[PDB]
Amino acid sequence: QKISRPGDSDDSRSVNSVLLFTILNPIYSITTDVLYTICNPCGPVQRIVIFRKNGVQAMVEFDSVQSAQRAKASLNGADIYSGCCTLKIEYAKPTRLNVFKNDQDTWDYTNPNLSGQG
């Protein structure tokens, strides 16, 4: 019928591999390179985009929802400078993000033309 060691916690369910980020005390610089180096040790990132026309916010996407589940479970309420620029994470409303170019405002890490310098 079923294995003698079934799953638990309903596998924490699933919704999407896309996340929404917000900064609470923005007093230092933030770019797609800063959000990538704090999201990469939590899982393989695929793309990032940033918005600061009002406050400071960003969005991130991973190669699997399993990596997005670990991302907000280890980066929510975190800090990038051991103080201030405190993070706040939740799931975003789309099921996929998109990128148009690679710069400090948006970047893609899975395109076949992501460019490089070495």
PDB file of C-alpha atoms in Angstrom:
ATOM      1  CA  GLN A   1       0.000   0.000   0.000  1.00  0.00           C
ATOM      2  CA  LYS A   2       2.509   2.639   1.197  1.00  0.00           C
ATOM      3  CA  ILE A   3       6.048   2.770   2.653  1.00  0.00           C
ATOM      4  CA  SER A   4       6.474   2.236   6.421  1.00  0.00           C
ATOM      5  CA  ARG A   5       8.184   5.667   6.634  1.00  0.00           C
ATOM      6  CA  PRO A   6       5.867   8.153   4.853  1.00  0.00           C
ATOM      7  CA  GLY A   7       6.342  11.937   4.686  1.00  0.00           C
ATOM      8  CA  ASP A   8       5.327  14.470   7.360  1.00  0.00           C
ATOM      9  CA  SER A   9       4.407  18.177   7.746  1.00  0.00           C
ATOM     10  CA  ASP A  10       2.612  17.781   4.385  1.00  0.00           C
ATOM     11  CA  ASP A  11       6.026  18.461   2.765  1.00  0.00           C
ATOM     12  CA  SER A  12       5.432  22.165   3.612  1.00  0.00           C
ATOM     13  CA  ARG A  13       3.386  22.266   0.349  1.00  0.00           C
ATOM     14  CA  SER A  14       4.383  24.216  -2.785  1.00  0.00           C
ATOM     15  CA  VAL A  15       3.286  27.339  -4.692  1.00  0.00           C
ATOM     16  CA  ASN A  16       6.130  28.710  -6.871  1.00  0.00           C
ATOM     17  CA  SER A  17       9.936  29.063  -7.098  1.00  0.00           C
ATOM     18  CA  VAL A  18       9.607  32.879  -7.186  1.00  0.00           C
ATOM     19  CA  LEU A  19      10.145  35.148  -4.159  1.00  0.00           C
ATOM     20  CA  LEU A  20       9.669  38.795  -3.181  1.00  0.00           C
ATOM     21  CA  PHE A  21      12.251  40.663  -1.074  1.00  0.00           C
ATOM     22  CA  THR A  22      11.944  43.906   0.919  1.00  0.00           C
ATOM     23  CA  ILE A  23      14.565  45.837   2.910  1.00  0.00           C
ATOM     24  CA  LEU A  24      13.556  47.341   6.277  1.00  0.00           C
ATOM     25  CA  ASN A  25      16.555  49.597   7.091  1.00  0.00           C
ATOM     26  CA  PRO A  26      18.204  50.437   3.731  1.00  0.00           C
ATOM     27  CA  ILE A  27      21.329  52.461   4.602  1.00  0.00           C
ATOM     28  CA  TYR A  28      23.847  50.637   2.354  1.00  0.00           C
ATOM     29  CA  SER A  29      24.060  49.788  -1.363  1.00  0.00           C
ATOM     30  CA  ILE A  30      22.247  46.748  -2.798  1.00  0.00           C
ATOM     31  CA  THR A  31      22.597  45.246  -6.296  1.00  0.00           C
ATOM     32  CA  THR A  32      21.888  42.006  -8.185  1.00  0.00           C
ATOM     33  CA  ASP A  33      25.423  40.914  -7.214  1.00  0.00           C
ATOM     34  CA  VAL A  34      24.726  41.379  -3.478  1.00  0.00           C
ATOM     35  CA  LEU A  35      21.403  39.516  -3.623  1.00  0.00           C
ATOM     36  CA  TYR A  36      23.008  36.711  -5.648  1.00  0.00           C
ATOM     37  CA  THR A  37      25.853  36.120  -3.167  1.00  0.00           C
ATOM     38  CA  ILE A  38      23.374  35.840  -0.266  1.00  0.00           C
ATOM     39  CA  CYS A  39      20.907  33.632  -2.216  1.00  0.00           C
ATOM     40  CA  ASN A  40      23.433  31.273  -3.871  1.00  0.00           C
ATOM     41  CA  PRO A  41      24.462  29.453  -0.619  1.00  0.00           C
ATOM     42  CA  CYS A  42      20.739  28.699  -0.089  1.00  0.00           C
ATOM     43  CA  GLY A  43      20.247  27.217  -3.586  1.00  0.00           C
ATOM     44  CA  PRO A  44      20.874  27.669  -7.338  1.00  0.00           C
ATOM     45  CA  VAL A  45      19.522  31.096  -8.349  1.00  0.00           C
ATOM     46  CA  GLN A  46      18.303  31.684 -11.924  1.00  0.00           C
ATOM     47  CA  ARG A  47      17.473  35.419 -12.058  1.00  0.00           C
ATOM     48  CA  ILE A  48      17.091  38.612  -9.990  1.00  0.00           C
ATOM     49  CA  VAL A  49      15.506  42.073 -10.455  1.00  0.00           C
ATOM     50  CA  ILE A  50      15.450  45.151  -8.181  1.00  0.00           C
ATOM     51  CA  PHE A  51      13.155  48.153  -7.643  1.00  0.00           C
ATOM     52  CA  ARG A  52      13.826  51.327  -5.607  1.00  0.00           C
ATOM     53  CA  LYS A  53      11.534  54.008  -7.090  1.00  0.00           C
ATOM     54  CA  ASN A  54       9.822  53.828  -3.671  1.00  0.00           C
ATOM     55  CA  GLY A  55      11.549  52.183  -0.692  1.00  0.00           C
ATOM     56  CA  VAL A  56      13.839  49.271  -1.638  1.00  0.00           C
ATOM     57  CA  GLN A  57      12.634  45.866  -2.888  1.00  0.00           C
ATOM     58  CA  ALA A  58      13.798  42.983  -5.098  1.00  0.00           C
ATOM     59  CA  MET A  59      12.716  39.632  -6.566  1.00  0.00           C
ATOM     60  CA  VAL A  60      14.534  36.288  -6.892  1.00  0.00           C
ATOM     61  CA  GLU A  61      13.934  32.986  -8.709  1.00  0.00           C
ATOM     62  CA  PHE A  62      15.494  29.522  -8.294  1.00  0.00           C
ATOM     63  CA  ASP A  63      15.822  26.374 -10.423  1.00  0.00           C
ATOM     64  CA  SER A  64      13.464  24.547  -8.025  1.00  0.00           C
ATOM     65  CA  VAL A  65      10.815  25.444  -5.438  1.00  0.00           C
ATOM     66  CA  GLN A  66      12.852  23.323  -2.997  1.00  0.00           C
ATOM     67  CA  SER A  67      15.562  26.000  -3.264  1.00  0.00           C
ATOM     68  CA  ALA A  68      13.044  28.840  -2.851  1.00  0.00           C
ATOM     69  CA  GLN A  69      11.682  27.116   0.283  1.00  0.00           C
ATOM     70  CA  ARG A  70      15.205  27.054   1.773  1.00  0.00           C
ATOM     71  CA  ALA A  71      15.894  30.618   0.595  1.00  0.00           C
ATOM     72  CA  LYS A  72      13.176  32.356   2.638  1.00  0.00           C
ATOM     73  CA  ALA A  73      13.714  29.866   5.494  1.00  0.00           C
ATOM     74  CA  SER A  74      17.363  30.998   5.897  1.00  0.00           C
ATOM     75  CA  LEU A  75      17.309  34.624   4.626  1.00  0.00           C
ATOM     76  CA  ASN A  76      14.119  36.065   6.163  1.00  0.00           C
ATOM     77  CA  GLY A  77      14.864  38.571   8.950  1.00  0.00           C
ATOM     78  CA  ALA A  78      18.571  38.258   8.019  1.00  0.00           C
ATOM     79  CA  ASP A  79      21.131  41.056   7.546  1.00  0.00           C
ATOM     80  CA  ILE A  80      23.760  41.560   4.820  1.00  0.00           C
ATOM     81  CA  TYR A  81      25.990  43.910   6.874  1.00  0.00           C
ATOM     82  CA  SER A  82      25.528  42.249  10.306  1.00  0.00           C
ATOM     83  CA  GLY A  83      23.226  45.221  11.007  1.00  0.00           C
ATOM     84  CA  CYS A  84      20.670  47.322   9.097  1.00  0.00           C
ATOM     85  CA  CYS A  85      19.527  46.491   5.547  1.00  0.00           C
ATOM     86  CA  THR A  86      17.448  43.796   7.286  1.00  0.00           C
ATOM     87  CA  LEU A  87      15.659  41.446   4.878  1.00  0.00           C
ATOM     88  CA  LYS A  88      11.990  40.431   4.671  1.00  0.00           C
ATOM     89  CA  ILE A  89      10.906  37.619   2.331  1.00  0.00           C
ATOM     90  CA  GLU A  90       7.612  36.192   1.035  1.00  0.00           C
ATOM     91  CA  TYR A  91       6.333  34.446  -2.119  1.00  0.00           C
ATOM     92  CA  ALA A  92       5.562  36.573  -5.193  1.00  0.00           C
ATOM     93  CA  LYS A  93       2.313  36.496  -7.210  1.00  0.00           C
ATOM     94  CA  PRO A  94       3.728  35.323 -10.613  1.00  0.00           C
ATOM     95  CA  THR A  95       4.907  31.747 -11.255  1.00  0.00           C
ATOM     96  CA  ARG A  96       7.874  32.968 -13.347  1.00  0.00           C
ATOM     97  CA  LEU A  97      10.088  36.056 -13.688  1.00  0.00           C
ATOM     98  CA  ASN A  98      11.788  37.511 -16.779  1.00  0.00           C
ATOM     99  CA  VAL A  99      15.001  39.443 -17.563  1.00  0.00           C
ATOM    100  CA  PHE A 100      15.972  41.752 -20.437  1.00  0.00           C
ATOM    101  CA  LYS A 101      19.673  42.465 -19.755  1.00  0.00           C
ATOM    102  CA  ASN A 102      22.476  42.022 -17.190  1.00  0.00           C
ATOM    103  CA  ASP A 103      23.314  45.021 -14.964  1.00  0.00           C
ATOM    104  CA  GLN A 104      23.084  46.176 -11.318  1.00  0.00           C
ATOM    105  CA  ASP A 105      19.261  46.504 -11.590  1.00  0.00           C
ATOM    106  CA  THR A 106      18.468  43.096 -13.153  1.00  0.00           C
ATOM    107  CA  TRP A 107      20.533  39.994 -13.978  1.00  0.00           C
ATOM    108  CA  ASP A 108      20.066  36.476 -15.361  1.00  0.00           C
ATOM    109  CA  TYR A 109      22.202  33.431 -14.482  1.00  0.00           C
ATOM    110  CA  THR A 110      20.625  30.788 -16.771  1.00  0.00           C
ATOM    111  CA  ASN A 111      20.543  32.576 -20.166  1.00  0.00           C
ATOM    112  CA  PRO A 112      22.899  31.187 -22.868  1.00  0.00           C
ATOM    113  CA  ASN A 113      24.176  34.771 -23.364  1.00  0.00           C
ATOM    114  CA  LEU A 114      24.668  35.978 -19.764  1.00  0.00           C
ATOM    115  CA  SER A 115      28.126  37.328 -20.808  1.00  0.00           C
ATOM    116  CA  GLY A 116      31.296  37.278 -18.670  1.00  0.00           C
ATOM    117  CA  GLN A 117      34.893  38.516 -18.297  1.00  0.00           C
ATOM    118  CA  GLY A 118      36.813  35.232 -17.826  1.00  0.00           C
TER     119      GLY A 118
END
